[PDB]
Structure 1
Amino acid sequence: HWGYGKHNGPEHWHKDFPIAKGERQSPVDIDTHTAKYDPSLKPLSVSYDQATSLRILNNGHAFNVEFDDSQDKAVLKGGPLDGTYRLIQFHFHWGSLDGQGSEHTVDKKKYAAELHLVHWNTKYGDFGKAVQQPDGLAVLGIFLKVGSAKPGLQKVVDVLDSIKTKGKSADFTNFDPRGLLPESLDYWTYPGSLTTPPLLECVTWIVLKEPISVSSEQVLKFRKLNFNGEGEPEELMVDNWRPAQPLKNRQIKASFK
């Protein structure tokens, strides 16, 4: 199946998922000089105070921190969004070296990693129904750069040891996602898709301008995970990012002057 290697990586995805070459694929390069400030965007609202994390899973492509989304707890709203989107999981994409790993780019600059907080539109009732709609998802994207440590990330970092290989999971309750947010909520927004197969075009992307800093030691532990399952030949989990795709007929809007 799909992966990030030479025989099954992003250049191969289109054969099983033809939408890979579609009209609103993600990620994209964010050209700051073409993006336009949009005075019509309402303030963004990130309400994660009642968030309930449940588990962490190595799914063979990245690791997912999963949240109880059976009630309106952790929600994203305002900004370009209409209605309420509920947090279902977060995950990251990173590189083998600090000069690469993010999916979106900013004037071609690649960050060391990128965090995705995935949310689904509550008017569609469940995630699986939301991903059959053009406005079913909202993903909050946050860049990571290497510098000082991010305190809020350490509990994540500490448990990776226990989910080294594909298919392993650990209990991961009471984690507070607010500790992964930067100070500013200034963002760029555009309509796009999920960046892993099946690459569904159901997402309103909200990419924060301000990156968070994580330590070299923290990112280094991400690089010790495995894409393979227990007992198989070790293939480090690194470079699990899709590169920038064609912007096509899309405009990127800025929330800030």
Structure 2
Amino acid sequence: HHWGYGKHNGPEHWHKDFPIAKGERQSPVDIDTHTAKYDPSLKPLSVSYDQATSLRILNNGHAFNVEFDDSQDKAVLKGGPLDGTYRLIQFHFHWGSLDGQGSEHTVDKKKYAAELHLVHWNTKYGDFGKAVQQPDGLAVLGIFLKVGSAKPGLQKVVDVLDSIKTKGKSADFTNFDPRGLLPESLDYWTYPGSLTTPPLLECVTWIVLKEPISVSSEQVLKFRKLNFNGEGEPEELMVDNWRPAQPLKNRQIKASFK
């Protein structure tokens, strides 16, 4: 009876195993665009993905992760609200059963069809497992997906999903360039928060881009063909793998733009 996104094990239940679910810096949140304060002291973000080394794509039963070699400073996030160097470890998405839901963060209560999370850890802590124990351990770049024109740089991901339909399946996934998933603008909102999945650790500096990327209806339809279940188990489509907005509590969302 482990955690998931069902009626019986979904986000409203998580606090029984993970009491930090009701903590002071949980994610995601609604971004109230009128209340977010422009912070002229924030820097431009530095996304340095030219030497990124993708390795593998995994269906872990709650999403699919594209994993990177994070044993050296190849794909790093710096600048913006961040102190020091954060190494890309994986990206994944959250999405809906229909185009009107799927994102974890919302913007003036608007839900996007999906949300991409590029997960990075602070090199001062040496490894990901140590970094998630620190209040400045992770930096997650969040990007909203809307349905419209196809995203060219997403198609290599969509094309391999048939090979990882069920929980525990993986495939080689080399030479993938995450720069093809970024919007034109790096204008962002930032706030201190948490992992949006158990163990819900309060270790994340969130950096959520204002400009969504456009994906095609066919691209997101292929996400919705994945399965939460393992091979030979009753089919449960991997949809609505999003946690809803959590209380902002004693936090300020800052904007990088006027």
Give the TM-score band, short-chain normalised: over 0.9
- How many Å apart are 1:79 and its aligned residue? 0.3
Tell me the equivalent position of 2:145: 144
- How many Å apart are 1:32 and its aligned residue? 0.3
* SS of aligned partner of 2:111: coil
Distance in 2 separating the partners of 1:229 and 1:202: 30
Q: Normalization by structure 1: what TM-score?
A: 1.00
* SS of aligned partner of 1:162: helix
Distance in 2 separating the partners of 1:52 and 1:128: 20
Distance in 1 separating the partners of 2:23 and 2:54: 33
- How many Å apart are 1:150 and its aligned residue? 0.2
Deviations, residues 89-139 of structure 1 (Å, cap 9, x unaligned): 000000000000000000000000000000000001110110110000000
Tell me the equivalent position of 1:253: 254
Distance in 2 separating the partners of 1:160 and 1:171: 12
- How many Å apart are 1:43 and its aligned residue? 1.2
Q: Considering only aligned residues, what root-mean-square deviation do their CA atoms show, in Å?
A: 0.3
- How many Å apart are 1:42 and its aligned residue? 1.2
Percent identity, aligned pairs only, is 100
Deviations, residues 173-217 of structure 1 (Å, cap 9, x unaligned): 000000000000000000000000000000000000000000000
Deviations, residues 138-185 of structure 1 (Å, cap 9, x unaligned): 000000000000000000000000000000000000000000000000
Distance in 1 separating the partners of 2:126 and 2:30: 32
Tell me the equivalent position of 2:51: 50
Distance in 1 separating the partners of 2:109 and 2:43: 28
Distance in 2 separating the partners of 1:252 and 1:221: 33
Aligned pairs for 1:164-179 (under 5 A) are 164-179=165-180
Tell me the equivalent position of 2:108: 107
- How many Å apart are 1:243 and its aligned residue? 0.1
Distance in 2 separating the partners of 1:233 and 1:125: 40
Tell me the equivalent position of 1:231: 232
Q: Which residues of structure 2 form unaligned runs of 5+?
A: none
Deviations, residues 204-257 of structure 1 (Å, cap 9, x unaligned): 000000000000000000000000000011000000000000000000000000
Deviations, residues 18-69 of structure 1 (Å, cap 9, x unaligned): 0000000000000000000001101100000000000000000000000000
Give aligned pairs, total.
Answer: 257
Distance in 1 separating the partners of 2:35 and 2:43: 21
Q: Which residues of structure 1 form unaligned runs of 5+?
A: none
* SS of aligned partner of 2:118: strand
Distance in 1 separating the partners of 2:129 and 2:241: 24
* SS of aligned partner of 1:154: helix
Distance in 2 separating the partners of 1:180 and 1:230: 30
